């Protein structure tokens, strides 16, 4: 019927016993001390992220899962660059919800754990699973707030987590279903449901040609799947003329590498090479849901990178919208090609800031793995804003260098203005970033290389194995704070 | 109390049983760059007669394959009593550093700074643009960063997160594994391995693998071994002494 | 304090509710129906291998773990070639014991589940972990039979499982600790504790040289670690002159591949290249513990395979004890070299049967993986005996071919009588077997290639991740039945 998730903290030195949250304390009282009694009988105390289940304590809650929240006053961890208490809550609540789901319980009430937004994030991110294409599926669990005192915060958590889950769905869906057109249609419907103060333009190939986006076009042509340039507007500012914030995302729905073909092992994960587009578009959907008082534009060039008799050939020179020529030495360095055109187009909006996201390089994965998203930016103010937002969400960012040292290695080009792969194999994420900078003149630009945080195995406790949708929540938080 | 510097001194690294590829293996004669830079920095500090006490520690040896060599899977005991599963014999720098870092604590130092041409991952990460610095002290990061602005021999901070530690203490036979669970973030997991042998509050690990050589990146250095970031270390010491 | 593991079966069509075992039924009665009541409250029924924990049902058992046993009458599964009921019990009991251990309970009583030997095997194999070299260790759990009616069978299970766990320990231990000498000393002490009717001879290099075992010696020389030829005798037959059964095991304590050096990835697992020696020696220790009325001889050539200035060089020709010359084309095909000499020596005992085991080829792993041990034999009677024993133990065997087709590919040799690697890359396990057959004239010989069952991830539910010690129990069962 109905399950209940309650939290308990680690015992502090002067306490005689570990303390329940307010809800746990109230429930124990409701059952005349039976919860504390049974917890004591069960043995060792619950530590952070651990769970234990007690049956039959109340007729309304046949299964009660108690979860360890760790130290009650855990705040910002100076060494980890995140709010520890929030992370403990997300992990603990996710673990509790997965136990409720294993017991095949369709609905669960969740203890706010002193921070309803974090509790909601743990439950909603934790229960998520992409199973539309399977016969065998786990029970669908409906999680709601236990109590009625922390509603806005709980709902805020549901909203943030839902945005990330939308990104996860888009990334996880196989490329034959999640084509450029399909991705555009799903984003279009989600944005329109979020707010009527939106406009969506799924720009066709003819428009792309009119816009002289030769770099983007060169990538798309190898495949039979039609390319599209998704342009979305959210008019949240009270002043329609207020300069917008522009987000740009790499939308390669499937990357085979092209003529510079990839190895077979785990190439299926490349269905998520559109993660950059997924995260920035989902962030905008969420911003619209929150009705943030700001104008935002989202740009996402979308296409496949396939080998064929029409595909990009190593050595080919293409002309970007801005007139710059690019020597395509490696057709698998295609994300930067489509981004060159989208970044150029972004300047036409005279934006306040330009932020792009892309599952750009394997080098980024070798550099930081799934620990944090690499951020390249020409603005310390912007770096700081993204960094502060990440401490709150727990979806960490780490700064990477934008030095001429790297630029020199990409403009040293045999046939053109810029080469699409560096002179050497070193610092691949840095030279890719340098390539992108040659198409940016804006003073507040940030490039997020999310290749290393594309998937999750078990690193983030509250995300099941699969595409991660990171760092969608950090982007939403940045926008929220920016709007305030 | 002295400042303690520690340097990886592998005079030649063939990789051992987990043998390296032949191409450009000659550059491994510089796998003692960590020892070279910290020892040279101390020589210079002495020349300048800086008013500070400094201790330099440099474990030195070769890593070669033979009938007596480390075998993948072997478990060894560090000076501190911790056991280490040697899954890859080419991840040897962290093995010799574990013992030197333990010994460093005996001096009750003010700070502990180690340097090592530790991982190819660092090279893939930042190349020769800057030395990667892993530190549990923002004060120390800042001091090294400011010194680097002056010398031009740049440093860039890399993360010391439990996220990476988890991947090296998840070990089949011992307390810590000498290579991570996955291939991602090699410089970060190597740093995490080193941290398991450090309890000091002001420690910095400099992975100089990417700045080991110079082609033409630094205009004033001819092609060859670079000796970076020796000047940044000297500057740090000078300012520290003042 | 004390935990309890109880089993419950899957409900049969005409039953109103799933049936507990006799012990589960008795415990429920003891607590006035409280176990059934709480199990019903907890939800969906327990299926095979699943577990659920109930707290505070009895003062003597604060934690009771109920485990799903599947269908009560599950017997031999025609398609899987094993006794299904026994497999269900081993898996269920192991899962239950791991839950008790997670709760940090030091002692547990285990329901015999209608088959005490299988229950004991699940508990003892299930709880095993090699942690001698770690600071952090799980609680040591002492498992005993619940009740006093099935003692001999429970103890038989403990004995079989202990034999396998000894093999696992020997295989898991790092090679710098588990050297040829150390392995010999550990086996020596275990055999002597098992019975006084034993003799152990840790033969030194001088003896090996006297025995003209040039093939074995050629492998050992590349390393600084002294080689030994372990010879063990168990005189269990009433007639001292009764011909013995001879077991032979490949004891490469560490295999780097030698000059034909292995790749670095996962080379640490080669510390278990002595699995052949581990399994046959452990089987003999167990046979001695059981005091089987038969004479058995165990032979295990032990050494390392390392690269150095003295190592085997590709193309070198060596002379086996039997006078045959061998062209060592690949130094990593060393197991067959040391086995050639041990198999020759085995004939001197005028044995009834000769069975050898070896983690011999990667081809075997590509062929059957961890599903079953590959068995090559010139005797269908022997194949059948091993096959029947495996149905009982669940540690499956599968027959592989001994055809001249494969022999032709190894005697087609440029410099010698036989080549240590075949003409082609196909059928690697089959040509390796053919190589071994050139050193056997006995009419009842079986070669077990255990390379594919060297480790366990999660395939065998009752074995934690690590070296498996398979198929030790099948060997013990074969010996038991043979003795009867
Ligand atoms: Zn997708
Ligand atoms: Zn690509
Ligand atoms: Zn791509
Ligand atoms: Zn090395
Ligand atoms: Zn090295
Ligand atoms: Zn071993
Ligand atoms: Zn071999
Ligand atoms: Zn071998």
UniProtKB/Swiss-Prot annotation, chain B:
User: Where located?
Assistant: Cytoplasm
Q: Which residues carry this modification: N6-acetyllysine?
A: 181, 215
Q: Which residues carry this modification: N6-succinyllysine?
A: 181, 202, 215
Residues the entry annotates as binding Zn(2+) 2: 8, 13, 31, 92
Query: Would you indicate the residue range of the signal peptide?
Result: none
In which residues is Zn(2+) 3 bound? 29
Residues that bind Mg(2+)? 13, 90, 92
Q: Which residues form the active site?
A: 20, 94
Q: Which residues bind Zn(2+) 1?
A: 13, 90, 92
UniProt lists the family membership as follows: Belongs to the peptidase M17 family.
Q: What does this protein do?
A: Cytosolic metallopeptidase that catalyzes the removal of unsubstituted N-terminal hydrophobic amino acids from various peptides. The presence of Zn(2+) ions is essential for the peptidase activity, and the association with other cofactors can modulate the substrate spectificity of the enzyme. For instance, in the presence of Mn(2+), it displays a specific Cys-Gly hydrolyzing activity of Cys-Gly-S-conjugates. Involved in the metabolism of glutathione and in the degradation of glutathione S-conjugates, which may play a role in the control of the cell redox status.
Subunit arrangement? Homohexamer.
Under which name does UniProt file this protein?
Cytosol aminopeptidase
The organism's taxonomic lineage, starting at the top: Eukaryota, Metazoa, Chordata, Craniata, Vertebrata
Q: Which part of the full protein is shown?
A: 275 to 516 of 519
């Amino acid at each position: 019927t109905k399950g209940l998730v309650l939290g308990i903290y680690s015992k502090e030195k002067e306490e005689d016993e570990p303390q329940f949250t307010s809800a746990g304390e109230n429930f124990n009282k409701l059952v005349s001390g039976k919860l504390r009694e049974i917890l004591n009988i069960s043995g060792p105390p619950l530590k952070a992220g651990k769970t234990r289940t007690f049956y039959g304590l109340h007729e309304d809650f046949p299964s009660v899962v108690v979860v360890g929240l760790g130290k009650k006053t855990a705040g910002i961890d100076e060494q980890e660059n995140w709010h520890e208490g929030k992370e403990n809550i997300r992990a603990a609540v996710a673990a509790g919800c997965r136990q409720i789901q294993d017991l095949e319980i369709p609905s669960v009430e969740v203890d706010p754990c002193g921070d309803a937004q974090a509790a909601a994030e743990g439950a909603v991110l934790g229960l998520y699973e992409y199973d539309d294409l399977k016969q065998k599926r786990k029970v669908v669990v409906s999680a709601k707030l236990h109590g009625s005192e922390d509603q806005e915060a709980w709902q805020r958590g549901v909203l943030f987590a839902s945005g990330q889950n939308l990104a996860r769905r888009l990334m996880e869906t196989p490329a034959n279903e999640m084509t450029p057109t399909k991705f555009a249609e799903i984003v279009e419907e989600n944005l329109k449901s979020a707010s009527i103060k939106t406009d969506v333009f799924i720009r066709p190939k003819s428009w792309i040609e009119e816009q002289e986006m030769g770099s983007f076009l060169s990538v798309a042509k190898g495949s039979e799947e039609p390319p599209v340039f998704l342009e979305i507007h959210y008019k949240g500012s009270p002043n329609a003329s207020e300069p917008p914030l522009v987000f740009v995302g790499k939308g390669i729905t499937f990357d085979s590498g092209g003529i510079s073909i990839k190895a077979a092992a785990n190439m299926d994960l490349m269905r998520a090479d559109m993660g950059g587009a997924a995260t920035i578009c989902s962030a905008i959907v969420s911003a619209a849901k929150l009705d943030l008082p700001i104008n935002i534009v989202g740009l996402a060039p979308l296409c496949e990178n396939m080998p064929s008799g029409k595909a990009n050939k190593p050595g080919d020179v293409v002309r970007a919208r801005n007139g710059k020529t690019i020597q395509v030495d490696n057709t698998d360095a295609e994300g930067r090609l489509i981004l060159a055109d989208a970044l150029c187009y972004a300047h036409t909006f005279n934006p306040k800031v330009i932020i792009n996201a892309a599952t750009l390089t394997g080098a980024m994965d070798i550099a930081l793995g799934s620990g944090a998203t690499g951020v390249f930016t020409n603005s310390s103010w912007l770096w700081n804003k993204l960094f502060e937002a990440s401490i709150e969400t727990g979806d960490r960012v780490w700064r990477m260098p934008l030095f001429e040292h790297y630029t020199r290695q990409v403009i040293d080009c045999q046939l053109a203005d810029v080469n699409n792969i560096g002179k050497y194999r070193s610092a691949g994420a840095c030279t890719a970033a340098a390539f992108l900078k040659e198409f940016v003149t804006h003073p507040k630009w940030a490039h997020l290389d999310i290749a290393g945080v594309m998937t999750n195995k078990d690193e983030v406790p509250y995300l099941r194995k699969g595409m991660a949708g990171r760092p969608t929540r950090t982007l939403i938080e940045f926008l929220f704070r920016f709007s305030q």
